[PDB]
Every structure is written in structure tokens, then in C-alpha cells.
């Protein structure tokens, strides 16, 4: 509901005021301590074109006059007394599109800025571009760029950015154009972000989905505790980057507690929690954990983290502590490393290696037989010669190597085939003066080189 209307009153003894500057109308409105708004219109022949709204604060009591570029308000002091009748001081609130007015005698710039505001309200920004060329105040360029955001024109907006020498925002716009050429809404969002207006990025492509970019924006505003709770319910594909970014944020804050717990929460404790402990020279505490009320939280999770067990096993293995490595590998059930260690030791503990290799062959056979028997129901009527094979066990490789070092090459060939080492299989098969095993292993390799050379190997 309005209360009063006001035209732009020209200044006393100032007859050089522009024509369009005479036609701007300001209205004081309040919604149904009430909100206050001041709304601006251009009283054109075609009707009333709305320019902009302007909310007023609690101390801003009302509007008394308009004199461009200022609403003249008989307000009270922010810390003053509204009950006081004597605290009625005038405030010249700037027009929203009259920012950066360094000179109060700036006449041509003010007139061309008013013309630009009129043309922006009309909208067809092609000559609104020329409305500001006379102006060298960069605030006019910023307002033009905001208009370019609201409209959706970017070739003007690139010049709008690059004439203010905002090389950060121009770089962002160029990268958005280069990487996302099909989508223009993302480039508009990048431009809006470079213009220090941030609520628009979600509103741009809210439900048509761009959850990753708004997650990055939510992080970039320092609102981690908003981004993580947004992504937990709404964007499940990027919980780990939010946790990792918060962990890096805490590490740069020199708070190893939260940094370590969030590097745990990001499922990157295989490489990053040991990084922090090793680069803080806190390796004694890590050894203590691997082999205090707040330490309960750490010790609840740390000793049984399978990735941590595996990393500590590798660490002690390369620290020339073979037996502690074996202990931690068995605690982490990494079959391949255990078999490698056992086949590497002097003496090579061959029987336990064979037992673990055959246990994994047993599990692989179980999976292959389960899938084959599951598939054979429809293969009862459908005759299929699907010569599927169980997943070969890589850990068997070392075992064959042991027989490869013991002259039991006939035994080694079986484990090489069980490992999938077709090249090592034919390497073994050479010395038997055998060719059929060579040929069928080459076929089973299913790689062109393995028959491509064994062809003329057989021809000689």
C-alpha cells in the first residue's frame, strides 16, 4: 500500500538537469513495525516501468523528498531515540544505481548514468552499452555487468569485466566458456559470483541439477557446516570432497585433532593420516596406536582400520622389519603381500604360502561355480559353450617363481596358469619341448602379441 509519491526535484539554481532525470518517480510503500519500501518508476508514455525497490531500516522512518541521486529521509539515529522529537535528522540515501559518486558536481556522468538506468529499465541493452561509454566511473560498469547477469548477455559482459581489470573474474568467465560451452547458465552463475552477488547461484539451476558447483560455492563462502548437511541429504556423490576440504582447512589452521579426524572421515586414512603423523614427527603415538579421555575417540577407530594396518605393514616392511610386517599383513588379510613375503624369506615358508594360495583358489572356485550354476538354469534349454574360468589368483605367481627357482617347472606351470601368467606360462613351457601348451596358453592370453610372436616361434 503506498503513502506518497514524489518526482525528482531539480536542484536550486541548476537548470542544466537532463530531461529523463525529470521523469523519475519515487513511491513510498509498505506491505500488508511494518516493512518500508521505496520503489522507483520511469513515467514513460507507454506506462509505468518499474526501476528498483529499496527497503528502509527501522530508524529510516519515511521518505520526505527526492532529489537525484538521493532519497531525502527524515529518519532518526541508529542508536538515537525514535521517541525523541528532536532526533529527526535528514539522510540522503543513495540511489542503488548511483553508486561510486565521488564528485557531487559530476554532471555528465550523472546524466549518462540516469540515461543508462532508464535504458536498463527499458531493457534492450544494446544502446544501454552506449549509455555508459561516456562514463568512466567503474561503478557504472559494475551496474551494467549486473544488468548483463540479469538479462543473459555475455559478450557485452566480458568487456564489462575486462574494462574494470577484474582479471580474476575475467579468468573465471573465460574458463567457464572454455570448459562448459554448451551450458550458458553456468557461465551466468560464474559471472554473478565474480560480481559479489552469491545468492543467485542456487537459484539459477536449482532443480535442473548442478549440485556440485553450488557445493563448491557453499564451501567457498566458509559455510562448510552448510555444505556438508546439504550434501548428506541432497548430494551424496561428494561427501568425501567436503570432508577432505574441511580436513585441509583444519590442517592449515594447525589443529591436528580435527584435521586427523576428518581425514579419517573422508576415507583417505590410508595415505593422509599417516602423512600428518609422519610430518608432525608424532610417529611414536602412531606406533602406540598400532601396537586420556579424548584419546578414547581416536583409539575407538584407529587400531582396526584395515587401511591403516596395511600401511603400517608396508612401512615396517620397508623399515627392514619383516616379521612385524607379516604380523600386520595377517592382521589386514592382504594375501598377496603375505605370500610375497613368505616366498621371499630364507627359508621360504612354502607350505603356508601354498595353503593361503589354495585357500584363495578355493574362494575363486566357489564364486565361479556359484555364478555358473546360477547361469545354468537358463542354459538348460539354451546350449551355450561359455568356457568361463575362475578368477586367477595373482598371489600364486611367487609360488610358481619358487618352483621356477627349483627346477620344478612342471609344477610351476600349473600355478602360472592358476595365476593367469600366460607369458610366464609359456616361458616355463619352452623347456619341455612342448608346443600344444604353448599354443593354448597363447590362445587363452587373448592378447595379439602372444600369438603374434609364438607363431614364428612355432615355425622354427
Amino acid at each position: 500500500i503506498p503513502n506518497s509519491v514524489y518526482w525528482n526535484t531539480p536542484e536550486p539554481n541548476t537548470t542544466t538537469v537532463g530531461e529523463f532525470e525529470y521523469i523519475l518517480l519515487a513511491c513510498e510503500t509498505y506491505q500488508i513495525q511494518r516493512p518500508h519500501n521505496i520503489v522507483t518508476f520511469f513515467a514513460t508514455h507507454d506506462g509505468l516501468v518499474l526501476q528498483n525497490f529499496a527497503p528502509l531500516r527501522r530508524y529510516q522512518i519515511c521518505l520526505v523528498g527526492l532529489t537525484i541521486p538521493d532519497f531525502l529521509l527524515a529518519s532518526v539515529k541508529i542508536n538515537g531515540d525514535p521517541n525523541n522529537a528532536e532526533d529527526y535528522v535528514i539522510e540522503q540515501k543513495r540511489l542503488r544505481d548511483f553508486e561510486g559518486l565521488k564528485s557531487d558536481k559530476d554532471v555528465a556522468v550523472r546524466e549518462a548514468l540516469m540515461k543508462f538506468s532508464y535504458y536498463a529499465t527499458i531493457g534492450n541493452m544494446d544502446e544501454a552499452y552506449r549509455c555508459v561509454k561516456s562514463i568512466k566511473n567503474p561503478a557504472a560498469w559494475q551496474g551494467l555487468a549486473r544488468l548483463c547477469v540479469t538479462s543473459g548477455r555475455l559478450d557485452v559482459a566480458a568487456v564489462c569485466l575486462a574494462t574494470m581489470e577484474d582479471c580474476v573474474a575475467a579468468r573465471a568467465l573465460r574458463e567457464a566458456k572454455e570448459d562448459y560451452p554448451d551450458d550458458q547458465d553456468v557461465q551466468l552463475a560464474t559471472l554473478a559470483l565474480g560480481l559479489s552477488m552469491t545468492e543467485e547461484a542456487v537459484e539459477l539451476l536449482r532443480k535442473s541439477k548442478r549440485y556440485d558447483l553450488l557445493t563448491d560455492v557453499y564451501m567457498a563462502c566458509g559455510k562448510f557446516e552448510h555444505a556438508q548437511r546439504h550434501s548428506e541429504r541432497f548430494d551424496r556423490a561428494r561427501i568425501r570432497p567436503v570432508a577432505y576440504k574441511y580436513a585441509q582447512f583444519m590442517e592449515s589452521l594447525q589443529n591436528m585433532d580435527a584435521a586427523i579426524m576428518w581425514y579419517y572421515n573422508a576415507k583417505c586414512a590410508s595415505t593422509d593420516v599417516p602423512r600428518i603423523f609422519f610430518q608432525t614427527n608424532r610417529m611414536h603415538e602412531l606406533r602406540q596406536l598400532m601396537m586420556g579421555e579424548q584419546q578414547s575417540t581416536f583409539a575407538t577407530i584407529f587400531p582396526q582400520n584395515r587401511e591403516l594396518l596395511l600401511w603400517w605393514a608396508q612401512h615396517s616392511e620397508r623399515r627392514h622389519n619383516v616379521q612385524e610386517a607379516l604380523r600386520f599383513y595377517n592382521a589386514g588379510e592382504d594375501v598377496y603381500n603375505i605370500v610375497r613375503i613368505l616366498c621371499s624369506l630364507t627359508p621360504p615358508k612354502l607350505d603356508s604360502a601354498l595353503q593361503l594360495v589354495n585357500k584363495e583358489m578355493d574362494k575363486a572356485k566357489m564364486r565361479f561355480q556359484q555364478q555358473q550354476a546360477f547361469a545354468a538354469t537358463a542354459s538348460a534349454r539354451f546350449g551355450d559353450d561359455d568356457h568361463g574360468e575362475p578368477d586367477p589368483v595373482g598371489s600364486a605367481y611367487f609360488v610358481a617363481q619358487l618352483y621356477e627357482r627349483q627346477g620344478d617347472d612342471q609344477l610351476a606351470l600349473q600355478y602360472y596358469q592358476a595365476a593367469g601368467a600366460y607369458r610366464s606360462g609359456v616361458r616355463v613351457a619352452w623347456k619341455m619341448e612342448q608346443y600344444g601348451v604353448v599354443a593354448n596358453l597363447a590362445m587363452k592370453s587373448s592378447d595379439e602379441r602372444l600369438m603374434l610372436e609364438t607363431a614364428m616361434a612355432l615355425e622354427k
Partner: protein, 306 residues
């Protein structure tokens, strides 16, 4: 050992298989001033040159020639950085790896003795019998490697008035504490005025400013009390090519476009590229152009100029 103006280097455990002691310098034209010894480096400063030798083989590795002469030398405990006073009563920090001398700004030659901190390798102190001042050397800022005395805030050149407390005899520096060998023989401890409150993470202006002036920026981020301090820390973190801290500070400062720009360059370690990107962000396009030009990615000034 220094006798007759020459230094003999000899093994301690006299064994027949041990080699003969050697004598330095090789040319007697230059009078020796000071020496220092590390586990692997033998450093001696004449009035002309500072020379370093590898103890395992005794070959010259670094030889920085002081054109303005040498009056005194003070080598860092690792025998790589030498704070040396020439004949002109000015102090120069010398990195012997790059053989680069930097003028110690703010150096008053009243304090003629220099002691490196035994914990932090980027802090030393200049003292006389009366008082001491603190110097921090940054290995890489946007202005290259620098060395500046710690100054009082709201004081660009001078430091605070110092009515000298009597009797104190500074002897050694460690973590901002000066071990002073008293005449009585006991070792008093004097905390540095530039290292007070630097171990509290509560909001306090003094803590932030002291850790700010010592290039302990990441620590100083815990003691921020006002956004003015925050933006100062952001500018300084960009200044010394610390991208990660720049992102960390700017996350509070609500400048998301800058944060998303910095996150693309937080990984590059070449110094020229970081200098160019940081100068462009700060707005120094001209310097950024030549920084990119002498870099390994020259085609970035082109995209900048477009």
C-alpha cells in the same frame, strides 16, 4: 684451530691411518675473521670471501665474495646462511647456496653481535651489551628473499623506546628465550619482547601481531580478532606464495571467486608462476607479465592481456 692468523683442521683421534691436518686459507693475502664448523661443512670468512668446504673431501663448494669487505661473520648452525657485517657497518644475510646477499633492513650497527635462533632457522637476533633486536628472513616473498628487523606496529622505521634494564648479558637464543650467562655464573632467561604471547590461540591482538611479524602466519590465523587482521593476513599469505593459507583465510573473508581461482593454482610449485598469478590477483599486471614471461608457462601473459 685459529693460530697465527691461519686455521688448521685436524682429526681428534690421533691414528696412523688418519690423514694429515690441512691449513686454510690457501692464499695469505686475505686476513681471516671468523670460522664455523658443522658436521659436513667447514666455513671460514676472510676479509674478502666466505668459503665453505665439504668435510668428507675438502673441496670448495660455495665462495661468496664480499666486495665491500668483511668485518664480522655469524654463520647459521647448519652453515648455509651467514649474517655478516662488512666494513660499512651494515649487516647482510647471505645464502651460500644461491650466493645471494640481502641487505638487513632496519639494522642499526650499534648491536654488532648476531645469534641465530637454534629452533627456527628464519630468525636471528642482533645484540650489544645493552639491548637486542629480532630479524626475520623470508626465503621467498614476492620481492624475493628478504631479511627485515621486527618493528613495532605503528612504526615504519624506528622501534620502541628501550630504557635499558641493567645487568643483563645475553649469551644464547632458543625459541625466543635468551639464555644470559650472569656474572654470578647462573643462567638467567629473558623472554624476547617480540616472542611474547605467541603460544596462545585465544583471540588477542598482540599474539597475532607477533606471530604475524615472524612469518608464523598459519599459527597467527588462530589469534585473529578483527576482519582487518584477517585481510592483512590474507594479503601477507599471498605475499609469500602460501596458496593454501590464502585459501584458508579467504574462506572466512567471503570472496568466493578468489577462492575458486586460488584452488586451481594451489598445486603449482614453480616460483615464477606463483609470483605471476599472485601479482595478477593483487592487481600488479605489469610485474605479472614479466613473471609469466620468464616462467615455464609463458603463454599466460597472453591470456592475461586478452
Amino acid at each position: 684451530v685459529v693460530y697465527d692468523g691461519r686455521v688448521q683442521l685436524s682429526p681428534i683421534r690421533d691414528t696412523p691411518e688418519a690423514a694429515a691436518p690441512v691449513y686454510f686459507p690457501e692464499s695469505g693475502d686475505t686476513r681471516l675473521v671468523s670460522i664455523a664448523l658443522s658436521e659436513v661443512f667447514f666455513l671460514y670468512a676472510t676479509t674478502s670471501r666466505v668459503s665453505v668446504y665439504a668435510l668428507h673431501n675438502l673441496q670448495q663448494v660455495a665462495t661468496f665474495t664480499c666486495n665491500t669487505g668483511l668485518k664480522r661473520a655469524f654463520a647459521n648452525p647448519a652453515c648455509t646462511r651467514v649474517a655478516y657485517v662488512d666494513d660499512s657497518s651494515e649487516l647482510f644475510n647471505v645464502n651460500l647456496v644461491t650466493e645471494v646477499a640481502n641487505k638487513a633492513e632496519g639494522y642499526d650497527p650499534d648491536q654488532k653481535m648476531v645469534l641465530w635462533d637454534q629452533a627456527e632457522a628464519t630468525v636471528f637476533i642482533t645484540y650489544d651489551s645493552e639491548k637486542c633486536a629480532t630479524f626475520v628472513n623470508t626465503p621467498h616473498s614476492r620481492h624475493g628473499a628478504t631479511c627485515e628487523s621486527v618493528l613495532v606496529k605503528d612504526s615504519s622505521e624506528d622501534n620502541l623506546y628501550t630504557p635499558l634494564p641493567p645487568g643483563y648479558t645475553p649469551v644464547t637464543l632458543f625459541r625466543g628465550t635468551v639464555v644470559c650467562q650472569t656474572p654470578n655464573g647462573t643462567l638467567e632467561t629473558v623472554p624476547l619482547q617480540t616472542h611474547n604471547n605467541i603460544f596462545l590461540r585465544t583471540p588477542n591482538a598482540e599474539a597475532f601481531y607477533n606471530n604475524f611479524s615472524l612469518n608464523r602466519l598459519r599459527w597467527s590465523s588462530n589469534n585473529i580478532t578483527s576482519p582487518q587482521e584477517a585481510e592483512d593476513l590474507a594479503v601477507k599469505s599471498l605475499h609469500m606464495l602460501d596458496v593454501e593459507l590464502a585459501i584458508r583465510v579467504y574462506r572466512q573473508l567471503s570472496q568466493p571467486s578468489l577462492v575458486l581461482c586460488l584452488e586451481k593454482i594451489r598445486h603449482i610449485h614453480e616460483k615464477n608462476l606463483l609470483l605471476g598469478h599472485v601479482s595478477m590477483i593483487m592487481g600488479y599486471m605489469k610485474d605479472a607479465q614479466n613473471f609469466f614471461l620468464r616462467s615455464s608457462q609463458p603463454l599466460r601473459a597472453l591470456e592475461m592481456r586478452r
